Amino acid sequence: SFVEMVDNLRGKSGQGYYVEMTVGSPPQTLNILVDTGSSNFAVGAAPHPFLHRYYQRQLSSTYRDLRKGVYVPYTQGKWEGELGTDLVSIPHGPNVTVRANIAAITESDKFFINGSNWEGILGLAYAEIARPDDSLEPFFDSLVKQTHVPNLFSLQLCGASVGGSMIIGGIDHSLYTGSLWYTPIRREWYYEVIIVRVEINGQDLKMDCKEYNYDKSIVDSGTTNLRLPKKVFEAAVKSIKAASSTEKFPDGFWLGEQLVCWQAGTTPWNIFPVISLYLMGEVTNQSFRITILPQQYLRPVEDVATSQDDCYKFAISQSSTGTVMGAVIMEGFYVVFDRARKRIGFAVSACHVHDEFRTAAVEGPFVTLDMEDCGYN
Ligand SMILES: CC(C)c1cccc(CNC[C@@H](O)[C@@H]2Cc3cccc(c3)OCCCCCC(=O)N(C)[C@@H](C)C(=O)N2)c1
């Protein structure tokens, strides 16, 4: 019965992927951002300029106040509110209702996005990073404990205005091609993984693999860009700059500020390199790689002037809190969050990014010695 969840995600480019949910009795419908980079389920619960609707606790006969405050600071944006519980369902999801923790957002700062069409956020990571502390059980833990939904979910994030699928409880084989390749979840807090090698156009960056995971590497559907530690970011940009030097870009382009444009249909994709990320595998000295096309890390953006040229934003930014494999990395892959077996699977998505001569890929096996040494401690 996973067909009922195919195409249950929508969104606008760069404004996150969201799924429809209901909270309370009678059910109040809200669009909820799908975020594997945090662990709090929170919804707008007070008027806000960018909110078209919000959770009205007074109108829910099943609402229970927990008499406890909460706030969450993200990398960008934050909110505060009041903790409580209520009945929650996913219309295009499993046919179940669960009582879950809900943070009623009463105040926020640079969190909600004008015209995003979502009113809350579903943190799908583990209790260890929940606010105010790990005793506040995350939504997915409650779903698994209260129903028979198996302890895993899979995400198919599709590019172009955007759509995708969140399969709750399993793997839908109609959403991918080829083989699934699995990397261990290093520790159950974020979805933490270990990157063991990085290549750009087949050239090894030749860095200490610890640099790739300093101070951690996570799979984060709630972050748009690929975010890289300072030293790795500098090496990647230098390599990407050289490969595309036949064209000039403003320096602000490489910072994610300015947007580059070309005549409609003349974007020179061939001058931008592919990025291969090698992930620790399931067996001794074995890794696998996922290859990222430039159509993934050059996010298309609405032409500020006369919409007559294809314009893009550089979707790779610098990080001071480790590597983030964000939405642009996940797009075109089918990513399986196999919580039950502490692993994350990758396969080419059925909605894969199309280049003419190159293709996004998930390939293995590879031999990589000393993979354990790549984890930061
Ligand atoms: C909460 C704790 C556990 C924590 C602290 C710091 C970092 C993390 C890692 N995970 C971050 C995500 O949880 C967050 C979600 C989030 C917050 C606000 C808006 C969101 C998603 O959608 C809008 C779509 C556009 C996304 C733009 C974008 O890339 N962002 C807004 C990044 C910068 C980010 O901050 N996204 C987790």
For residue 237, the SS3 value is helix
Asked if 197 contacts 287 with a C-beta cutoff of 8 angstroms, the reply is yes
Instruction: At 263, list the tokens.
Output: 């005549």
Residues 192 and 341 in one domain: yes
Residues 78 and 123 in one domain: yes
The rounded distance, in Å, linking the Cα atoms of 376 and 21 is 37
What's the 222 CA to ligand 1 centre distance in angstroms? Answer: 5
Residues 140 and 156 in one domain: no
Give a yes or no: residue 2 inside a domain: no
Q: Give yes or no for residue 11 CB within 6 A of ligand 1.
A: no
Expressed in Å, this structure's resolution amounts to 2.2
Q: Give yes or no for residue 16 CB within 6 A of ligand 1.
A: yes
Instruction: At 139, list the tokens.
Output: 């939504």
Q: Cis ω on the peptide bond leading into residue 26 (within 30° of 0)? A: yes
Give a yes or no: residue 358 inside a domain: yes
Taking Cα atoms as reference points, which of 201, 156, 150, 148 lies closest to residue 174? 156
The rounded distance, in Å, linking the Cα atoms of 323 and 317 is 10
User: 312 pairs with which residues across the strands?
Assistant: 260, 300
Residues 218 and 302 in one domain: yes
Instruction: At 119, list the tokens.
Output: 């009113």
The rounded distance, in Å, linking the Cα atoms of 122 and 41 is 5
User: 11 pairs with which residues across the strands?
Assistant: 17, 162
Q: Give yes or no for residue 138 CB within 6 A of ligand 1.
A: no
Which residue has a Cα nearest atom 4 of ligand 1? 74
Last residue of a domain, one of 94, 123, 149: 149
Which DSSP string corresponds to 208-222?
-GGGGGSS-EEE-TT
Give a yes or no: residue 188 inside a domain: yes
Asked if 9 contacts 163 with a C-beta cutoff of 8 angstroms, the reply is yes
At 177, which helix (H) or strand (E)?
A: strand 176-184
Residues 204 and 282 in one domain: yes
Number of separate domains in the chain = 2
Last residue of a domain, one of 99, 131, 149: 149
The rounded distance, in Å, linking the Cα atoms of 25 and 32 is 18
Its sign, for the CA torsion 158, 142, 194, 174, is negative
Residues 135 and 160 in one domain: no
Which residue has a Cα nearest atom 25 of ligand 1? 15
Q: CA 42: distance to chain centroid? A: 17
What's the 281 CA to ligand 1 centre distance in angstroms? Answer: 27
Residues 250 and 357 in one domain: yes
The rounded distance, in Å, linking the Cα atoms of 353 and 360 is 7
At 235, which helix (H) or strand (E)?
A: helix 230-243
Give a yes or no: residue 8 inside a domain: no
Spatial CB neighbours of 50, under 8 Å, sequence gap ≥ 6: 112, 113, 114, 115, 116
**Strand pairing category for 298-300 and 309-314:** antiparallel
* Neighbouring C-beta atoms of residue 370, cutoff 10 Å: 9
* Neighbouring C-beta atoms of residue 357, cutoff 10 Å: 6
Residue written as token pair 């499993």: 94
Q: Give yes or no for residue 332 CB within 6 A of ligand 1.
A: no
The rounded distance, in Å, linking the Cα atoms of 199 and 212 is 12
Instruction: Provide the residue count of the chain.
Output: 377
The rounded distance, in Å, linking the Cα atoms of 218 and 31 is 25
> What type of residue sits at position 79?
W
Taking Cα atoms as reference points, which of 168, 200, 164 lies closest to residue 332? 164
Half-sphere exposure of 252 (CA within 13 A, CB side): 4
**Strand pairing category for 226-229 and 316-319:** parallel
The Cα angle at residue 277 between residues 321 and 287, in degrees rounded to 5: 110
- Give the full edge-to-edge strand order of the sheet including 275-280: 203-204, 195-200, 275-280, 286-292, 361-367
- Give the full edge-to-edge strand order of the sheet including 323-325: 192-193, 217-219, 323-325, 226-229, 316-319
Residue written as token pair 């993984």: 193
Residues 157 and 140 in one domain: no
Breaks in the chain (C to N over 2.5 Å), named by the residue before each, are 160
Asked if 343 contacts 182 with a C-beta cutoff of 8 angstroms, the reply is yes
Last residue of a domain, one of 149, 179, 207: 149
Phi (first) and psi of residue 271, to 5 degrees = -85, -10
Residues 243 and 335 in one domain: yes
Residues 123 and 190 in one domain: no
The rounded distance, in Å, linking the Cα atoms of 7 and 29 is 18
Taking Cα atoms as reference points, which of 316, 139, 140 lies closest to residue 226? 316
Residues 131 and 220 in one domain: no
Taking Cα atoms as reference points, which of 329, 333, 334 lies closest to residue 294? 329
The rounded distance, in Å, linking the Cα atoms of 144 and 96 is 11
**Residue 54's CATH number:** 2.40.70.10
Instruction: At 342, list the tokens.
Output: 């502490």
Residues 165 and 300 in one domain: yes
Dihedral angle over CA of 234, 286, 357, 257, nearest 10: -20
Give a yes or no: residue 267 inside a domain: yes
Asked if 364 contacts 206 with a C-beta cutoff of 8 angstroms, the reply is no
Which residue has a Cα nearest atom 21 of ligand 1? 222
Q: Give yes or no for residue 38 CB within 6 A of ligand 1.
A: yes
Instruction: Using alpha carbons, list the distances in angstroms from residue 69 to 83, 133, 209.
Output: 6, 11, 41
Q: CA 37: distance to chain centroid? A: 7
What's the 168 CA to ligand 1 centre distance in angstroms? Answer: 21
The rounded distance, in Å, linking the Cα atoms of 338 and 144 is 13
The rounded distance, in Å, linking the Cα atoms of 101 and 63 is 10
Asked if 272 contacts 282 with a C-beta cutoff of 8 angstroms, the reply is no
| Residue range of the domain that includes 60 | 17-149
> What type of residue sits at position 137?
E
The rounded distance, in Å, linking the Cα atoms of 183 and 325 is 13
Catalytic residue IDs: 35, 220
The rounded distance, in Å, linking the Cα atoms of 297 and 328 is 6
Instruction: At 311, list the tokens.
Output: 């314009």
The rounded distance, in Å, linking the Cα atoms of 39 and 49 is 25
